[PDB]
Amino acid sequence: MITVSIAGGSQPEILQLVKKALKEAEQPLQFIVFDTNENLDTENLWKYVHCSDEAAVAQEAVSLVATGQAQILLKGIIQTHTLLKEMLKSEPILSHVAMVELPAGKTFLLTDCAMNIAPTQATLIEIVENAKEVAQKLGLHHPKIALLSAANFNPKMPSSVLAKEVTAHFNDQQEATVFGPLSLDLATSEEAVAHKRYSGPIMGDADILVVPTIDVGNCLYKSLTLFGHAKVGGTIVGTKVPVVLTSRSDSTESKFHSLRFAMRQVH
Amino acid sequence: MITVSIAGGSQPEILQLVKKALKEAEQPLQFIVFDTNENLDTENLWKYVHCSDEAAVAQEAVSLVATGQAQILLKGIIQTHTLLKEMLKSEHQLKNKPILSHVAMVELPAGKTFLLTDCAMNIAPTQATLIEIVENAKEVAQKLGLHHPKIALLSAAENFNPKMPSSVLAKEVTAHFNDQQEATVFGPLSLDLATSEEAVAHKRYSGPIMGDADILVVPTIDVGNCLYKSLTLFGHAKVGGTIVGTKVPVVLTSRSDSTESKFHSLRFAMRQVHHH
Secondary structure, three states: OEEEEEEOOOOHHHHHHHHHHHHHOOOOEEEEEEEOOOOOOOOOOOEEEEOOOHHHHHHHHHHHHHOOOOOEEEEOOOOHHHHHHHHHHHOOOOEEEEEEEOOOOOEEEEEOOOOOOOOOHHHHHHHHHHHHHHHOOOOOOOOEEEEEOOOOOOOOOHHHHHHHHHHHHOOOOOOOEEEEEEOHHHHHOHHHHHHOOOOOOOOOOOOEEEOOOHHHHHHHHHHHHHOOOOEEEEEEEOOOOOEEEOOOOOOHHHHHHHHHHHHHHHO | OEEEEEEOOOOHHHHHHHHHHHHHOOOOEEEEEEEOOOOOOOOOOOEEEEOOOHHHHHHHHHHHHHOOOOOEEEEOOOOHHHHHHHHOOOOOOOEOOOOOEEEEEEEOOOOOEEEEEOOOOOOOOOHHHHHHHHHHHHHHHHHOOOOOOEEEEEOOOOOOOOOOHHHHHHHHHHHHHOOOOOOEEEEEEOHHHHHOHHHHHHOOOOOOOOOOOOEEEOOOHHHHHHHHHHHHHHOOOEEEEEEEOEOOOEEEOOOOOOHHHHHHHHHHHHHHHHOO
């Protein structure tokens, strides 16, 4: 069974997500909610735990995960940084990982469209490691990780430099295939690979895409959603448990996919 | 009448383009190809012209554009650096704008259309550069018939985030244009809030631009490139691009580019040449 700890989850929006999950659940699921506000549940859909202050909520919610009682931390109505702080206070480099599903069934992981703004050599290596973990935790043995760049390698292009550097680093592990600079088409389309007579480690069949900055990841993330009609779900990695960041403006169906994504990582 | 100069265009790939263009062409069109490779023209389509080497091919192609001899320059099979360095020589005087930039025209499935700028020329524009990138794209749209174009300065967050370089850049460039009345320039704005009226409503956002931007301006070539490819690879969007800043639209072609792809850019260039 899977127990989800929700920080500040005694809100109708959360209640609605929980109610939905429990009914569409194909496996045992349980929610434990911490909140300063009064309980809104009567149908005993979750386990309510009142808290004195918000700081306590974050503390209590994170504790349930650190102690090994809950396997997923969900961010309800609470300041992202207050919960983020407590998270780290329990732990060094966190990164966001999203799961993308395109119409024809094409899928891939997209990493860091929220956390690290302008990843340096050292931070990008860690970002690759976290995504490497998430993949090799969903079954993908020896996953292909492409370092995205608009650069043929051009020293005047930061993403190109960063890519050639991160590539040299993982040229040992043998646990995964990490290569870049690689243009988007050359990492996701095998047709682009032939039409361009290209040959390399990754030929339009990457399992994970790593961006140079959040600007690139955010853009790609939104374009796949707006015009690509793709299903997406993401979680924050780096801690001993998958963390789902939810915003009021986010749809339930989106934060739902993230929830299932967090669930698949527990399996 | 529009004459097109092609650097290294004597190729079966370029031939397929010319045929298509001359076929769908409504107004008078003409092609003059320069190449070190032998001629492949049998139907007397274009006007073949042999050259000693690539440096020669480029010099001769760019020369024809140097004056009103040609109205559009198109890069067939030849090193980009060779032609680029070639068109940037003082002897030709082609450049006629503070800086050169790349501008693309994007057409989405239904009818949504917009310009995307700088995913090939300026790597990581400074405030001064971004300002000129906007001007270049603003002029293309005006020349295309749009009088008061909406120009969205794209960034990851919608609300100001000083920890983000693109966010700060957007705010500064916005302040710079807060004076003129030729166009509406605003940022930081996220892609969805810039191109999706529904997303705007969904988040109840309110601002000078609400999912109806005419031109999107990215912070770096990586963002524009990724968006560009993502649009065609998964968005079913039609895209055409040209380098602006010169007195003649410059179309960049790559052998790997499909015929429809080259055609769209060529179509975009012809449109800037005649459209008012």
